[PDB]
Amino acid sequence: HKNMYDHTEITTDSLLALLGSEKVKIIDVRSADAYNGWRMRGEVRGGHIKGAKSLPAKWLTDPEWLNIVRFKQIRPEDAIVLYGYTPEECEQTATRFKENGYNNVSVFHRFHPDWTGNDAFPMDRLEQYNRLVPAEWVNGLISGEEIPEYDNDTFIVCHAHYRNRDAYLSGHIPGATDMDTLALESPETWNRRTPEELKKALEEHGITASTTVVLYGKFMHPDNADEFPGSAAGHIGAIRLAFIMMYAGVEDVRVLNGGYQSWTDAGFAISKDDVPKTTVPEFGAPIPSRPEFAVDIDEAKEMLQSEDSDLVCVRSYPEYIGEVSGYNYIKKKGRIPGAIFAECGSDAYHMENYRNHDHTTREYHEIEDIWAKSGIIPKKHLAFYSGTGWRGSEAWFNALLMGWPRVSVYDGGWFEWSNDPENPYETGVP
Ligand SMILES: C[N+](C)(C)[C@@H](Cc1cnc[nH]1)C(=O)O
Ligand SMILES: [Br-]
Ligand SMILES: [Cl-]
Numbered sequence: 141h142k143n144m145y146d147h148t149e150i151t152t153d154s155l156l157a158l159l160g161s162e163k164v165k166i167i168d169v170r171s172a173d174a175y176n177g178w179r180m181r182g183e184v185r186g187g188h189i190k191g192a193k194s195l196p197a198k199w200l201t202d203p204e205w206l207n208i209v210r211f212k213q214i215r216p217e218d219a220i221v222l223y224g225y226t227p228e229e230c231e232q233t234a235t236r237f238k239e240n241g242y243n244n245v246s247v248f249h250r251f252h253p254d255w256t257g258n259d260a261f262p263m264d265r266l267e268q269y270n271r272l273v274p275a276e277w278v279n280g281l282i283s284g285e286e287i288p289e290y291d292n293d294t295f296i297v298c299h300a301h302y303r304n305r306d307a308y309l310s311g312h313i314p315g316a317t318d319m320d321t322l323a324l325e326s327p328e329t330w331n332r333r334t335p336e337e338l339k340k341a342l343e344e345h346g347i348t349a350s351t352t353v354v355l356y357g358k359f360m361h362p363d364n365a366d367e368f369p370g371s372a373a374g375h376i377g378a379i380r381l382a383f384i385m386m387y388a389g390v391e392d393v394r395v396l397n398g399g400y401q402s403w404t405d406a407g408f409a410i411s412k413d414d415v416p417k418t419t420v421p422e423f424g425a426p427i428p429s430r431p432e433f434a435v436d437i438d439e440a441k442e443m444l445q446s447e448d449s450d451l452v453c454v455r456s457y458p459e460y461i462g463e464v465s466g467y468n469y470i471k472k473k474g475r476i477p478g479a480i481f482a483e484c485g486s487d488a489y490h491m492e493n494y495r496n497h498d499h500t501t502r503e504y505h506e507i508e509d510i511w512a513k514s515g516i517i518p519k520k521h522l523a524f525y526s527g528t529g530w531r532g533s534e535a536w537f538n539a540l541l542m543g544w545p546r547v548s549v550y551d552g553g554w555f556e557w558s559n560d561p562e563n564p565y566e567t568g569v570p
């Protein structure tokens with residue numbers, strides 16, 4: 141009696157008995173930030189039912205919704221169990237599954253407060269979720285309102301871009317100041333700048349080591365035909381800057397999940413003011429305070445020879461096999477021998493394998509399980525890298541968020557490696 145609009149309820153007891161079943165898919169339709177652990181309705185335990193997959197109901201407007209579902213391996217032969225903060229928030233998702241040929245769809249009504257409120261009901265969360273902030277958190281922050289996971293009295297919202305002030309001037313978070321990516325990294329090496337330059341640059345942008353820095357960027361459809369495609373990949377640049385600031389010693393760095401798009405999707409006010417900087421005289425800590433976050437070429441070579449270490453290549457497949465360099469300023473094509481490949485996505489300016497279509501980070505369990513299939517696991521010292529370290533920093537950040545204890549960015553990347561003609565490299569399909 142398949143009813144597209146009337147959905148079977150599943151009880152708490154029934155769901156608890158199915159937690160280990162391989163043919164049940166439990167689907168969390170709340171925002172990815174709530175899934176990660178943010179207690180968006182004041183629940184005492186945040187996160188998701190253990191084993192649940194993330195499928196935010198916001199994505200129902202995506203024309204590729206069904207391909208998102210299929211790529212998550214959610215199949216018509218599965219028993220689908222949907223939950224959100226309320227069963228009403230699941231109704232449109234339940235219908236969309238039934239309209240696309242899924243005949244076994246139930247809704248679980250008692251996730252909150254029944255499941256969240258009882259410590260015998262298993263839940264999971266992204267261990268360092270408080271570094272990956274939702275738009276509502278940033279809005280409360282700049283509004284001077286009490287927000288969770290924030291006990292500081294000093295903050296700065298920083299809009300990152302690579303030589304493209306228009307990315308900021310065309311629309312930004314109220315009160316934010318822009319930080320060009322060249323302020324923290326050198327155009328000669330495309331590595332992080334020296335400690336003296338970083339100190340000066342951070343001070344001139346109004347940042348101290350005890351300032352809470354909220355970083356975001358704007359995705360503006362990077363095109364390889366342009367001279368600087370990176371000028372349109374603002375949110376990768378933001379995570380790259382988060383890497384450098386955390387290396388330098390900013391103790392509390394946050395990243396807005398999904399970048400500028402999350403802010404406008406949440407309906408918040410846009411500003412076009414060119415906000416002047418409020419400089420500070422003293423950064424307030426030795427730079428770098430966290431040198432272990434950065435790996436340079438000599439240590440990278442050692443890691444290729446150690447059993448407990450790996451370099452992780454976060455480049456595209458055409459870069460991997462030496463078909464393209466990836467960049468209009470890199471001539472050499474190939475790959476570092478001995479690195480573990482973790483395909484970023486389609487090219488140097490897209491991170492589709494680490495992101496959702498709305499640019500929020502991919503469900504971390506999926507990233508975790510793919511990495512584990514290649515032997516990328518938390519018990520190793522891992523140095524993520526890419527062409528010059530932007531994509532590598534975004535991979536690194538994702539592992540940092542899972543609480544992995546020895547993750548780093550090999551800053552130099554393929555740019556530095558291939559610039560020494562004495563360094564071995566491989567090419568072609570392996
Ligand atoms: C280091 N720059 C800013 C020159 C890179 C940054 C980058 C973006 N996606 C991969 N790398 C570039 O824009 O090519
Ligand atoms: Br981006
Ligand atoms: Cl039915």
Ligand SMILES: [Mg+2]
Pocket residue numbers: 158159160161162163164165166191
């Ligand atoms: Mg299951």
Ligand SMILES: [Mg+2]
Pocket residue numbers: 329330331332527528529550551552553
């Ligand atoms: Mg670099």
Ligand SMILES: [Mg+2]
Pocket residue numbers: 443444445446447448449450451
């Ligand atoms: Mg090794």
